[PDB]
Structure formats: structure tokens, C-alpha cells
């Protein structure tokens, strides 16, 4: 049961509601096995410092979640196999 911080860059065409639905389903797959979710922050739409998949902007999400390594890897593979998220990064701050 470690804690991780996942930053998610979602395609800019998303306009609310379905972003929340995606967040809910991914948090569900986290929480199916004892994986508590500490915080979900939606920065919103921001201009990308460079083009990502031909897109100049993106929706930024930060998910602080305490879970198992297998669970976080499975969440990462789900985010990868998804076609609606431009990029994902999984930080594990060793101290906090």
C-alpha cells in the first residue's frame, strides 16, 4: 500500500461531465481492491508548452492515490490502452 501521484493530460475536446465519468471509472478500478483515493484535482484546460498529438491544449488532472503497485500498474495500462487520454505520468514521491 504505497502512495502515488498520477498526472493525466486528457484530449482538449473533452468538456466536463465525460471527464468526470472517466475519472469516476478509473477511481473505481483503483478502489475495487482496497485502493483509497486521497485527492483528485482538475486543473482544467491549459495550453501545452508544445503540441501533443496535434493538439495545442489539454486537460490536466492530478490524482493522489494510496494503493498497491499492481493496482497502480493496472491503472496505468488502462490509461495507456485508452484512446481518449493524450499522456500519463506516474510519480511516486519517496517522502510524501
Amino acid at each position: 500500500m504505497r502512495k502515488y501521484e498520477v498526472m493525466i493530460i486528457i484530449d482538449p475536446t473533452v468538456e466536463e461531465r465525460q471527464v468526470d465519468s472517466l475519472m469516476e471509472k478509473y477511481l473505481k478500478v483503483i478502489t475495487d481492491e482496497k485502493g483509497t483515493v486521497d485527492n483528485v484535482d482538475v486543473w482544467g484546460k491549459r495550453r501545452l508548452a508544445y503540441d501533443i498529438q496535434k493538439k495545442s491544449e489539454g486537460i490536466y488532472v492530478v490524482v493522489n492515490a494510496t494503493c498497491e503497485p499492481a493496482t497502480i500498474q493496472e491503472l496505468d495500462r488502462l490509461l495507456a490502452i485508452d484512446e481518449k487520454i493524450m499522456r500519463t505520468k506516474v510519480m511516486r514521491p519517496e517522502i510524501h
Binding site: 508548452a49 508544445y50 501533443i52 499522456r87
Partner: protein, 67 residues
């Protein structure tokens, strides 16, 4: 030498926090050297790692190019 460049403190690095990373990135978009940024070795390492992460994660440009 380098003592006249007084040691600078930053606290938490937090690659999300773009303000410090901008303060330590060069005007061209590069990472400033230690002798010009005035950071300890550990703080400089953390700043460089955070800059690289922000670059890969689109919070910072790989090179600002034209000014």
C-alpha cells in the same frame, strides 16, 4: 569564485510548481549551470529532474527558441 554566488534555498521542488522551474531554466530554455544558479548539489539535482519531468509532461518547453 562561487562563494560570491550565495547559496540559494528553495524548499520543496514539486515539478508541478512551474515558478521555481522557470526561475532556474535559462532564457533559451536550458537548465542553468550550478555555478550560475547558486544551488547545492542535491537541490540542483532535484531541480534538473523536475525540469526534465515538466518537459516530458508539457508543463515546460524543451527549448523556448526565439527568446
Amino acid at each position: 569564485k562561487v562563494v560570491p554566488i550565495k547559496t540559494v534555498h528553495i524548499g520543496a521542488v514539486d515539478y508541478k510548481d512551474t515558478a521555481l522551474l522557470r526561475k532556474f531554466i535559462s532564457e533559451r530554455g536550458k537548465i542553468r549551470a550550478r555555478r550560475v544558479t547558486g544551488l547545492s548539489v542535491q537541490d540542483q539535482r532535484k531541480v534538473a529532474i523536475a525540469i526534465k519531468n515538466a518537459r516530458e509532461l508539457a508543463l515546460l518547453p524543451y527549448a523556448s527558441t526565439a527568446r
